[PDB]
Design a protein that fits this description.
The structure is cut from a larger assembly and holds chains A, B, C and D.
Chain B lengths: L1 H4 L2 E3 L1 H7 L4 H11 L7 E4 L4 E4 L13
Antiparallel strand pairs in B: 1-3, 2-3
Chain C lengths: L13 H4 L1 H5 L4
Chain D lengths: L1 H4 L25 H6 L1 H4 L6 H4 L7 H9 L8 H8 L2 H4 L1 H11 L3 H4 L3 H16 L5 E2 H7 L5 H7 L10 E4 L4 E4 L5 H25 L2
Antiparallel strand pairs in D: 1-3, 2-3
The chains are: A alpha/beta, B alpha+beta, C mainly alpha, D mainly alpha.
Chain lengths: ~260, ~60, ~25, ~210
């Protein structure tokens, strides 16, 4: 599959618009992304904002500015001519049912499949909660793609200036287990379709991990053997330094 | 020493080596040696020989760990 | 000198020549 | 020469065996004297692949066999070992031990110590030639006695020199696994702890 990369310039741009647009009472701020989707790795080097207002009790009322789309063409094209509109982004933690109708408005300006980017403004997740989706023909479905961080001279300089293993993964595995656990509890309470089909894929593919235990410990002892021959070398860098430090002490006594 | 030489050895074949007393004497001295996990073998009286239960192949176990 | 020079051998001297006795008779 | 007194047999086989065709030192050593030790260290480190090249088919030892046939070392012992025939291998052991190992000064000091290495070589070759064989079948094949068979294998198997299984009920011999993964790691236990002993002992001495 393809890849999606979001620069920290786009990250901080979407996260700052929360307090800039006075977004509260669980609302969203619809932006726009600028990148090159022609390659296999989608990289967004520019982003902007758009005014968005939606009623809480009415999902059929939403405001969008299509005039600002033509305003960035008179600006960005005079600086970077390789910037095009590959889609938009949202500041909400989870998508709603209105995103299906938003794709009809941007399909004329975008020259390719629009990209759906979701950025969590609450920062309540672990790692990179920012996710991306690609709308294709199912009627329509959203194909998720992994999100990475852009590494370039135009970003890491500003990141290092403002700012300056398994234990982290343990908290990440709990998020995947509790997500499926709470989904079953909410399902049984509201009743007594794609999740039920893919749910048993994990159960039939951790009692099954105990059959290879005989072959698992075969390569585990090699790790300790590699550490045993390395442990002897560890003393070679120590005792040798003790001999050198002893010769330094003999010169300090004569002083 | 004799257990490592012969995995399966008869009852009267050991007495011809160490010049022991009787056949019942050598049979009951082997059961005492496996108390501490030294010989690690079994004695089959119906078949008439002592078979070693150690197949080695400890690379698949957790003991070296 | 592991398991060799300490106990020497003290065998296979007169018993080696004695093997040819059973070879040239029973055959 | 010094490798024979320290019981090397490894580095000595890389010099006295494979070398040029003369090495005549006159007063010190002769050509027939150095060529005699070629079959001593050549039967230990060199496997069967090098026995048929640098020993048997080597032109240096071909001229000595046709000259002096009283050695019975580079010829009788090499042909019997290459054919893996114990019937003809036995009578050449006593003839070589008496007229070669005993008179030489750097040999008789080993003598039976060097004989123990030659016997375990032919027992290891035949061990890989079969899985299960009756004791009476091998006794009547290579012409070995049954009483002397138990004493020959009793000086090796308990020392973990050769892995063999013998069932005295049916009178058959089996073949154990010659090389295993755990058997290789057991040698690293003594080598690993042998190094850590020097690092700990000599490390505490200088402080």
């Amino acid at each position: 599959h393809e890849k999606v990369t979001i620069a920290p310039l786009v990250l901080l741009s979407a996260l700052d618009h929360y307090e800039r647009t006075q977004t509260k009472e669980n609302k969203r701020c619809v932006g726009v992304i600028l990148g090159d989707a022609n390659s296999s790795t989608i990289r967004v080097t520019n982003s902007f904002a758009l005014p968005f207002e939606e009623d809480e009790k009415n999902s059929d009322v939403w405001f969008l500015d299509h005039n600002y789309i033509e305003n960035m063409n008179e600006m960005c094209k005079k600086i970077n001519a390789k910037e095009k509109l590959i889609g938009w982004y949202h500041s909400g933690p989870k998508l709603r049912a209105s995103d299906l109708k938003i794709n009809e408005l941007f399909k004329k300006y975008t020259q390719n499949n629009p990209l759906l980017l979701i950025v969590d403004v609450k920062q309540q997740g672990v790692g990179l909660p920012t996710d991306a989706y690609v709308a294709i023909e199912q009627e329509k479905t959203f194909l998720h793609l992994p999100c990475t961080i852009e590494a370039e001279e135009a970003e890491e300089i500003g990141v290092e200036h403002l700012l300056r293993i398994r234990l982290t993964n343990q908290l990440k595995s709990l998020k995947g287990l509790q997500s499926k656990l709470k989904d079953v509890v909410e399902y049984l309470d509201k009743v007594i379709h794609t999740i039920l089909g893919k749910l048993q894929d994990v159960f039939n593919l951790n009692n099954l991990q105990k059959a290879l235990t005989v072959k698992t410990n075969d390569e585990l002892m090699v790790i300790y053997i590699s550490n045993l021959v390395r442990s002897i070398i560890a003393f070679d860098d120590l005792i040798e330094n003790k001999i050198q430090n002893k010769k330094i002490q003999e010169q300090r006594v004569k002083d | 020493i004799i257990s490592l030489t012969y995995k399966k050895i008869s009852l009267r074949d050991i007495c011809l080596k160490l010049n022991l007393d009787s056949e019942q004497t050598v049979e009951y001295m082997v059961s005492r040696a496996i108390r501490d996990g030294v010989i690690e073998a079994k004695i089959n009286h119906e078949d008439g020989f002592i078979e070693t239960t150690e197949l080695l192949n400890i690379y698949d176990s957790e003991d070296p760990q | 000198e592991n398991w060799d020079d300490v106990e020497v051998d003290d065998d296979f001297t007169n018993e080696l020549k004695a093997e040819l006795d059973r070879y040239k008779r029973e055959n | 020469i010094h490798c024979l007194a320290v019981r090397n047999f490894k580095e000595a086989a890389k010099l006295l065996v494979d070398s040029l065709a003369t090495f005549t030192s006159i007063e010190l050593t002769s050509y027939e004297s150095i060529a005699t030790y070629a079959s001593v260290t050549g039967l230990f480190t060199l496997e069967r692949t090098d026995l048929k090249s640098k020993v048997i088919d080597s032109p240096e030892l071909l001229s000595l066999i046709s000259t002096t046939a009283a050695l019975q070392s580079i010829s009788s012992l090499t042909i019997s070992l290459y054919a893996s025939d114990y019937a003809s291998y036995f009578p050449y052991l006593l003839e070589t031990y008496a007229n070669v190992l005993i008179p030489c000064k750097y040999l008789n000091r080993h003598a039976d110590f060097f004989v123990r290495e030659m016997r375990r070589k032919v027992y290891a070759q035949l061990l890989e030639s079969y899985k299960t064989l009756s004791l009476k079948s091998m006794a009547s094949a290579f012409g070995v006695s049954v009483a002397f068979l138990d004493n020959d294998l009793g000086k090796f198997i308990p020392n973990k020199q050769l892995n063999c299984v013998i069932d005295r009920v049916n009178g058959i011999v089996e073949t154990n696994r010659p090389d295993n993964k755990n058997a290789q790691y057991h040698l690293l236990v003594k080598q690993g702890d042998g190094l850590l002993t020097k690092l700990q002992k000599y490390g505490a001495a200088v402080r």
